[PDB]
Design a binder for this molecule. Structure first.
Ligand SMILES: O=C(O)c1ncccc1O
Length: 167
């Protein structure tokens, strides 16, 4: 049993809810919240900008020190950093950004990072301002992630379309 409430069950291991991931993290304090990161961990907008704002910019300060030490992530890669006031840990995962011309086949690699964590609160990778089709992102999630993932979908219209169209 866990703390997640009001989710629709899609499969054995994937759950979905119309929710603001920031507000969901604040309520649940999950072990792991996933950030929709870029390779530079520049948390300007989208999910990343919202998570970082909720940490009062402490996520960005920590991220800048990580990049200064380790250099950029890979597209499809991830790193584990603090969850600050939102979670124990934040898993920063870089999905391909279609609006930068990145290979959508890297979306599966991105989701494979989730398998290193037993339970996660996450957004749909490469959705929103990363430009991928969210229906596709949900299909890759279900077909890649084997651990227990709680997907918070910010937009109600998109949530309803994702549920209605789910095979
Ligand atoms: O549902 C999303 O894609 C989302 N986007 C931006 C900020 C928070 C979110 O949960």
């Amino acid at each position: 049993v866990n703390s997640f409430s009001g989710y629709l069950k899609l499969t054995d291991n994937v759950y979905i809810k119309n929710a603001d991931i920031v507000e969901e993290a604040k309520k649940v304090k999950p072990t792991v919240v996933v950030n929709a990161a870029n390779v530079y961990l520049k948390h300007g907008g989208g999910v990343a900008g919202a998570l970082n704002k909720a940490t009062n910019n402490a996520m960005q300060v920590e991220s800048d020190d990580y990049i200064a030490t380790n250099g950029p992530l890979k597209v499809g890669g991830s790193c584990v950093l603090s969850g600050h006031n939102l979670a124990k840990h934040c898993l920063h995962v870089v999905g391909p950004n279609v609006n930068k011309g990145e290979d959508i086949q890297l979306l599966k690699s991105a989701y494979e990072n989730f398998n290193q964590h037993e339970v996660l609160l996450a957004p749909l990778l490469s959705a929103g301002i990363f430009g991928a089709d969210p229906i596709h992102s949900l299909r890759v999630c279900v077909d890649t992630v084997r651990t227990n993932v709680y997907l918070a979908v910010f937009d109600k219209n998109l949530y309803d379309k994702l549920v209605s169209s789910f095979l």
